[PDB]
Design a protein around this ligand. Sequence first.
Ligand SMILES: [K+]
Ligand SMILES: [K+]
Ligand SMILES: [K+]
Ligand SMILES: [K+]
Lengths: 277, 289, 289, 277
Amino acid sequence: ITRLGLEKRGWLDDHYHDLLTVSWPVFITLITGLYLVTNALFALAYLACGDVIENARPGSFTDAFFFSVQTMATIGYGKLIPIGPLANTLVTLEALCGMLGLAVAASLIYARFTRPTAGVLFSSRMVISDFEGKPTLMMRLANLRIEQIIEADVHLVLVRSEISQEGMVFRRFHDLTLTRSRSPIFSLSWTVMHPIDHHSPIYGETDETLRNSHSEFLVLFTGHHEAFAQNVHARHAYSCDEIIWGGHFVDVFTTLPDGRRALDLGKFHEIAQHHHH
Amino acid sequence: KPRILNSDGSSNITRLGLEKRGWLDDHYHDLLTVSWPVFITLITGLYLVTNALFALAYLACGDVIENARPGSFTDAFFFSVQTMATIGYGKLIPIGPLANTLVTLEALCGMLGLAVAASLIYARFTRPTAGVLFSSRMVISDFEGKPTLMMRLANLRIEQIIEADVHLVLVRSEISQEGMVFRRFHDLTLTRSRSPIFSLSWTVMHPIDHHSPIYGETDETLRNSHSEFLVLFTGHHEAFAQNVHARHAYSCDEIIWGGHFVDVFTTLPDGRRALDLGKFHEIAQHHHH
Amino acid sequence: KPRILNSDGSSNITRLGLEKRGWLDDHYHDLLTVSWPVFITLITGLYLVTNALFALAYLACGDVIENARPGSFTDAFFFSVQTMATIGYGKLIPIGPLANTLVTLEALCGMLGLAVAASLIYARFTRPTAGVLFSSRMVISDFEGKPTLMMRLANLRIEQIIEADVHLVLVRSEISQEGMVFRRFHDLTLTRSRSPIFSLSWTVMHPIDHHSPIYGETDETLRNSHSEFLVLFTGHHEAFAQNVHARHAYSCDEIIWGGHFVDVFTTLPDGRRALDLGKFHEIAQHHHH
Amino acid sequence: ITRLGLEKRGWLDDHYHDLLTVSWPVFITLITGLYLVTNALFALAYLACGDVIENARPGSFTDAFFFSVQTMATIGYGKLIPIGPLANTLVTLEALCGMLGLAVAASLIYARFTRPTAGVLFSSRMVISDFEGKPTLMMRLANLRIEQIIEADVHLVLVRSEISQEGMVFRRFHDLTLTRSRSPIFSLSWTVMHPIDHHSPIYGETDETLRNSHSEFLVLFTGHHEAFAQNVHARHAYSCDEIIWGGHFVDVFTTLPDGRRALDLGKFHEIAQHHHH
Ligand SMILES: [K+]
Ligand SMILES: [K+]
Ligand SMILES: [K+]
Ligand SMILES: [K+]
């Protein structure tokens, strides 16, 4: 949806987010590029001063570009030294830039290092089938890394359209009661279940009624990943179509032919359903 | 009437325990708060002056800058720069134990300088603004058949804030049994104090039922107690992959009894909707004949 | 009997969804986990080889290293180093557009190299260990007149951990009405699950009252359900000024029914107490005639 | 209390904590020092190779020290270049060190920047006096900075010795119920109160009984300081002696002679007490 006020950019809000999200190769290409053009600009600036670089072919961009590069990176070989206030002032400027550039490039790199992905797999569907004697809404999550997640929290939120007394129709949110919503240590898989008891918002609902109310289900996951020593977040949304009534997730905890327990995420998205003649 | 809290949630009271600075509390905050243009200017500033100070220190040792014009500040200044930034061309080289001891020291300063400047730059990167807009006013009107205190927030960025929650706190003066007058905070029960995905607009509501601290209050009674309303919002901003928060405060005057916020969406010429934050602060009201 | 959870709380199950690496998931974790000696060795390693690769790249361009011995790796290698580290003495200077394009590139690599190495070093600094010791066993004995599941932790550092809390979770196999067998977690009610200042030792307790998942269980019954006990501890370590956590797990075999932990303090020759972590795992038991 | 197992140091546990806590001046002196001795060692190493530094007085420490300094800092003037595999290998080594050194020195500096003090003042005493009709245990906190603290939490914990049924005497903790324990925005002062109702652990206690049980009171404060954009922690402990029975804190919110409201922390530690003829 379009906004009408100040829809784009601001302070510390250039496409800086892009430098945080984009792929490493693209990130390195952007930096490398920004590195070359800046040395291209200083190279010109030196030429715009005439022949202020000793031992350099007059009016040559090359020798001027490489002089810049040797100044900014602070390599300072010594054959291409500066000449006269003009060059020595651009050098002072270019010295500061390379320092700021490094400072920045290091900031962005450490940042990108600290915004890791949750590495959490969400089942492609939800199911509503009996558990402990009651119809239950379920879905499951799997930890795709060997590192464990500490203090994992999950929320199952129902979003649908309802009518107020004043006659207004708005989107209402419902944090659904889970049998377990907190997991001290998340390591493998976790089946999140919502018992549909008399207190449930979807009690008495059917696939049809949920469609009418434009019902949707949000799953929000958060925890402290040991792999990154910092919190991670992940979420998924499910529409009515993605709910398998009568479905039962296929166990993923396999017992190996040789007395060992194993987890086979290959069956993670499998649902067992009964068929009628 | 002095408002205890400003609109941006800050305090409007004077401090008499006046104690200026401390350790790690110089302008360390002024470098993290100020704007980039100023931040950069200040840094460049400390950069030039620092090189200036050294340039002089070399002159105090007389002529210790080989291949440099005697007494020249220019030549000593550019020697400093070349040294501190570690460019080290080779023409201006030092001379004698004195010049070389400054070099060693100046080398450490530029080293520490880079480290500090890199810290500041990163830190400034880790204090993103929440980009959350508060409605200029609050309103009290019917929702689900009950008078409800309302106000709203809007996300000013395209990226969404998740695991967001809000706090609506009443602040007023009261009198204890011991006949003491004090200011007491009352966290207000919201119909919903969390938003899984905060992406457009959100109308926060406080039903004024029997359990409410303002149950039975009126514009007059709220005024006499000097009632104000504080709002804290927090969330995880995906844009920066880190948490953010926002605060706002309202006085009795900013409550429109009977008002209702107006739908914030318009229709572009083609026909598709669009959040018109221009109407975000608009409030509908019934006018009597 | 395969124990679902290892003692250090990790999983003892095999993964068949075998998918090795990804992005930002190379050995990025191996550099953060490994030991300093290895970390440094690996870095030094990548440092030498990288300079080695460039040294060769210059040789491919023939003789472009002025004042360097033709075909010499040694001279080209030390040119690389001098360039990448930006020392730039002045004797080995480049020659021709080819040599100068490598220099420009090598300058960027060392630049990025420093940034990365500085990141890793800082990161490794931000993953402190909790330095928390778990008792090798658990015990079930009377406290306040009730059988109580107990275990204890000890701080292995002089600095204290504050705002600490612990979690004792039972993990066992159960059968649903639909006749399904699954593993269910049961967070256990502790007499106290928080420690304001964790500095010495702490005995965590779970009274086994009517509300307990192990109310009425025995060593036999726990075994049949393959019951295990998971413990998570977290706190703010003042030593590093950041949060830390620790995990441990126990099997039925590690519960000493009737046992009691022994006071962990001794008496030095002078006469003052001292936490003897040597007795930390000791358990008193009554022996029958 | 002395520990008996492995009482001192370990990995990433050198007196590194000291480098994090110690004062800046001392920190800079330690770094500067570590900077000089390292260049003193390399200087020697070059001498232990003979005269491998061109244009340098033979066997001279000075010229060798400064050569090192010019190598490590990567200034590389060019008059003191290296000579023969020995020098060129120590240079490669010293190049790596300066890089690691900078990397480290920057780590420590940014760290020290991110472990700020809460800047919270605790009243020097506690009081037990009537509030809303009940005897109440109180104390107060003040924010010593203008920046505000978000999501401030405070706990008042009673620690005293009690006897179990098994006859064992141990230290029991009691998280005391506060009238308000959470403050969304902490800006000035905050009086933390514990109503001593029938449910209170100190109900019916006197100064004498609290002394016998070796009662103590812990106050723990935490919140997100805007000044540092990161959490802060502070705590204080109070003994029975520091409880003023019948005391009343002197209001600190002053009304300025000119219609303005002011906070005068000068009276923060003042308690009003009644006196008998
Ligand atoms: K350099
Ligand atoms: K140089
Ligand atoms: K040079
Ligand atoms: K030279």
